[PDB]
Design a binder for this molecule. Structure first.
Ligand code: NAG
Ligand code: NAG
Ligand code: NAG
Ligand code: NAG
Ligand code: NAG
Ligand code: NAG
Ligand code: NAG
Ligand code: NAG
Ligand code: ZN
Lengths: 588, 251
């Protein structure tokens, strides 16, 4: 019969037994994670190999059906996802070499000694709490020299092999292959292109340049008080003084730069301990939040299957917080819950991931995912934004019934959150731009480090303390770069997060600033959210974005509207100090 | 209307509903098992009030009235399905179960009973003894049973009984584990169909028969049909206990 009908029959055969193999492998992984031992590793590896072999065989079988004949725009989506030939185009020797390179990179990064003083916690504590110039410089340079120097030729060979593999799949470069996620075709008025994402990021970054400039000037002025003779008024911040090994986040800088240090922050750890919360009541409160918004209950097996506290001394378990979607109606949470505010907020976040997983469970197997890579963390995170407000903590009995808030605490909270939200956008943008240019071939192999540090000086405003020759490979030191991970998800996550928060806050009829806003007891906000949640990947991410915000493309205006009082206060504070930086000045 | 007389056939045989409801193993949905029950008095009140059934829906008969009636035959069809497909066992529905496995006519006259069975037939590691038909050439006429395992062909080229490209095995196996969701947990289903004909009734509800009277206007109830009028030995009802034809004259 027609190719459409054969494709439909093939997909109906695949979805069954795909769900089965996926459930078995996921259950094996959960058994290993909750109970680590020698025997469980063999089950985990066996199930993983079985699932991988099944997926490869089904891809080879699905290669037969030509994609032009199908005209359903859902069967076509599932076929497009399934015919992802990918890395198998490489020769057997080339594939072996590529896997060897990746494994060597992961091995060398995982075990790195600068002595004895491993990366964690030996070097993180030095880089986060030393407060001494010489110690921080020594740790920074030693880690660079020990790790990044050894990864130069491996990274060069990785670049050439990955570029050739990506060109083999009818793509221009490997960067284009990465950007292929943000691409929707075939729908009139909703289409998008990979060449559109190279722009629409430069534009939004040009919009937030002044806010970052003011924050950078304020931090440098407040930081010259310490380190008196090593910072210049006009110039860049030295690279190792950013409170991290790479300067990805500025959170550790908070203790140095507080606007009003007299006022303590809101902290309810002692309130929790006084009432003796039992590490299960936290998830009860999270469920109460999500019910009051208008979203459904939790499944009956969630409470009995999942483990929500450390198993004990006899049974060892890795418990990095995680939300598990095992399939077949099975949802679980892996957390070592303690009575602290951070655990309360992260319980809210993971519960949000689970609530996202329940929505599109009715969709076929290939379409059970977020609309793109940024939609899923943003939905997870707006829940924590709503749960952190003083109003919400006041409604529960843990915060004091008679609490009076002054604008000093508003400024402290806004600055604390801004050192993390808008402090990492320039770094993400610069890193991904450098990787895109390297893969494209614009930067020759002899000019990698010069262009990297020129971009660091020009875009981020961060200057290196000691010069680096072409033997060094600084970007390869980061976990994501050497271990083959995409990085543009963290740029778009914040933008989507703030757009969703503004839409949900305006739908719930809130008045005043955006950062005091709360969406509990609002059924219409929950219904608007659930309309987008239930789509899964079936509809283009532009349409899923329109169903909540009302705009097709991502916008940065709500991010600035969130940070407006902080911006006004910063302008007032920096009316006297210099704003901007000079590229010429260097520490040496 | 001086008196009221009711006459049902004398049956003292308790009806074997335990052999159907309480069974060691239930059959797969694709090949269900049918049991005929007759010459029995059926107490439908305990069946309704057992209160352990997830679904108890009667179509075309009031659930309380059917306690006291007479039927020519009763058929009971039992199987095991998934939690989410119990809604497909009802007239006019469509899906994987209704199209190819168990199709009910539109003019249904019976009760569908379904209860959770996750304790009995679901174990860790999977229970692959319960199958269901997935591909079929055409839909099923009401109350039709197919047990064939012929290779289903979707493409143009025939395949000589071997799996491969465009050839599939029709039956696919339910996988049952105790950790599954409620939607995927097993459910045991029993469908009762009440058949009426002109033949003498055999299955009847519990009621005590009384002596008959003649030449007086009394209310009569024979085999579930009720009327009023003088009964005269010979618009004419054959009482079941003695097989005498009686004339009904309005009073
Ligand atoms: C963890 O695995 C060990 C395997 O030696 C087993 O003895 C133990 O019972 C497991 N813990 C459980 C099932 O809670
Ligand atoms: C595509 O096929 C599905 C069933 O597989 C159907 O529900 C849907 O309506 C079809 N799409 C269009 C546009 O007809
Ligand atoms: C997979 O390999 C085949 C080799 O014949 C090639 O034609 C096909 O385009 C590849 N799939 C891709 C690139 O998605
Ligand atoms: C479902 O949510 C409602 C809303 O408050 C609650 O009353 C009920 O107990 C919940 N049921 C389950 C099984 O979670
Ligand atoms: C905000 O805080 C500052 C801190 O000094 C205070 O002077 C001012 O009165 C507060 N309110 C406004 C509206 O500025
Ligand atoms: C939400 O509704 C509950 C229901 O009584 C109430 O206790 C709580 O104060 C409300 N909170 C907000 C923020 O409306
Ligand atoms: C079936 O077993 C239950 C459990 O013992 C019992 O109560 C019931 O009378 C039995 N028969 C029927 C028809 O349910
Ligand atoms: C029951 O009905 C039959 C009908 O033929 C009759 O012969 C019999 O006398 C009645 N009574 C008993 C106790 O069987
Ligand atoms: Zn998350």
């Amino acid at each position: 019969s027609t190719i459409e009908e054969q494709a439909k029959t093939f997909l109906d055969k695949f979805n069954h037994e795909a769900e089965d193999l996926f459930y078995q492998s996921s259950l094996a992984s959960w058994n290993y994670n909750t109970n680590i031992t020698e025997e469980n590793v063999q089950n985990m590896n066996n199930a993983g190999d079985k699932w991988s072999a099944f997926l490869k065989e089904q891809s080879t079988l699905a290669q037969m059906y030509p994609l032009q004949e199908i005209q359903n725009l859902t069967v076509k989506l599932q076929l497009q996802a399934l015919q992802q030939n990918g890395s198998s185009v490489l020769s057997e020797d080339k594939s072996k070499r590529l896997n060897t390179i990746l494994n060597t990179m992961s091995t060398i990064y995982s075990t790195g000694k600068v002595c004895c003083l491993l990366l964690e916690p030996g070097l993180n504590e030095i880089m986060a709490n030393s407060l001494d110039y010489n110690e921080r410089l020594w740790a920074w340079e030693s880690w660079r020299s020990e790790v990044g120097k050894q990864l130069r030729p491996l990274y060069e060979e990785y670049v050439v092999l990955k570029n050739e593999m990506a060109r083999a799949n009818h793509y221009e470069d490997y960067g284009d292959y990465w950007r292929g996620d943000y691409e929707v075709n075939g729908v009139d008025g909703y289409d998008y292109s990979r060449g559109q994402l190279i722009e629409d990021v430069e534009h939004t970054f040009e919009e937030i340049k002044p806010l970052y400039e003011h924050l950078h000037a304020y931090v440098r002025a407040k930081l010259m008080n310490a380190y008196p003779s090593y910072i210049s008024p006009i110039g860049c911040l030295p690279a190792h003084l950013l409170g991290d090994m790479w300067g990805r986040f500025w959170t550790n800088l908070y203790s140095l730069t507080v606007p009003f240090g007299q006022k303590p922050n809101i902290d309810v750890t002692d309130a929790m301990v006084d009432q003796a919360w039992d590490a299960q009541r936290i998830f009860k409160e999270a469920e109460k939040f999500f019910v009051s918004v208008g979203l459904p209950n939790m499944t009956q097996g969630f409470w009995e299957n999942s483990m929500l506290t450390d198993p004990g001394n006899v049974q060892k378990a890795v418990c990095h917080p995680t939300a598990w979607d095992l399939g077949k109606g099975d949802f679980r949470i892996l957390m070592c819950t303690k009575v602290t505010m951070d655990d309360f907020l992260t319980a809210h976040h993971e519960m949000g991931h689970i609530q996202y997983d329940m929505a599109y469970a009715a969709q076929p197997f290939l379409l059970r995912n977020g609309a793109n890579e940024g939609f899923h963390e943003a939905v997870g995170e707006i829940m924590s934004l709503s749960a952190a407000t003083p109003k919400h903590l006041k409604s529960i009995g843990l915060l004091s019934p008679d609490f009076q808030e002054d604008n000093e605490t508003e400024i402290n909270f806004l600055l604390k959150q801004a050192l993390t939200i808008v402090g990492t956008l320039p770094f993400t943008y610069m890193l991904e731009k450098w990787r895109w240019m390297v893969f494209k071939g614009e930067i020759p192999k002899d000019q990698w480090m010069k262009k990297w540090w020129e971009m660091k000086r020009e875009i981020v405003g961060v200057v290196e303390p000691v010069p680096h020759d072409e033997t060094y490979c600084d970007p390869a030191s980061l976990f994501h770069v050497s271990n083959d991970y995409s990085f543009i998800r963290y740029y778009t996550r914040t933008l989507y997060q703030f757009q969703f928060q503004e839409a949900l806050c305006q739908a719930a009829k809130h008045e005043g600033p955006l950062h005091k806003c709360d969406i509990s007891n609002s059924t219409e906000a929950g219904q608007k959210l659930f309309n987008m949640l239930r789509l899964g990947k079936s509809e283009p991410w532009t349409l899923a974005l329109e169903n909540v915000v009302g705009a097709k493309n991502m916008n940065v205006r709500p991010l600035l509207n969130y940070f407006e009082p902080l911006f006004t206060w910063l302008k007032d504070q920096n009316k006297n100090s210099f704003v901007g930086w000079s590229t010429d000045w260097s520490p040496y | 209307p001086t008196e009221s007389i009711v006459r049902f056939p004398n049956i003292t045989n308790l009806c074997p509903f335990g052999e159907v409801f309480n069974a060691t193993r239930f059959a797969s949905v694709y090949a269900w098992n049918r049991k005929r029950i007759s010459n029995c008095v059926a107490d439908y009140s305990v069946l309704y009030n057992s209160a352990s059934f997830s679904t108890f829906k009667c179509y075309g008969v009031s659930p309380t009235k059917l306690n006291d009636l007479c039927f020519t035959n009763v058929y009971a069809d039992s199987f095991v399905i998934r939690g989410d497909e119990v809604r497909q066992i009802a007239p006019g529905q469509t899906g994987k179960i209704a199209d190819y496995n168990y199709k009910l006519p539109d003019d249904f006259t019976g009760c569908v009973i379904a209860w959770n069975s996750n304790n009995l037939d679901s174990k860790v590691g999977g229970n692959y003894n319960y199958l269901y038909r997935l591909f079929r050439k055409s839909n099923l006429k009401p109350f039709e049973r197919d047990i064939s395992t012929e290779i289903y062909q979707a493409g143009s080229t025939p395949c000589n009984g071997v799996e491969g490209f465009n050839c599939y095995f029709p039956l696919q196996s339910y996988g049952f584990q105790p950790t599954y969701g409620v939607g995927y947990q097993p459910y045991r289903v029993v469908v009762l169909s009440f058949e009426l004909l002109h033949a003498p009734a055999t299955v009847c509800g519990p009621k005590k028969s009384t002596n008959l009277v003649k030449n007086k206007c009394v209310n009569f109830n024979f085999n579930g049909l009720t009327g009023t009028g003088v009964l005269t030995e010979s618009d004419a009802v054959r009482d079941p206990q003695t097989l005498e034809i009686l004339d009904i004259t309005p009073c």
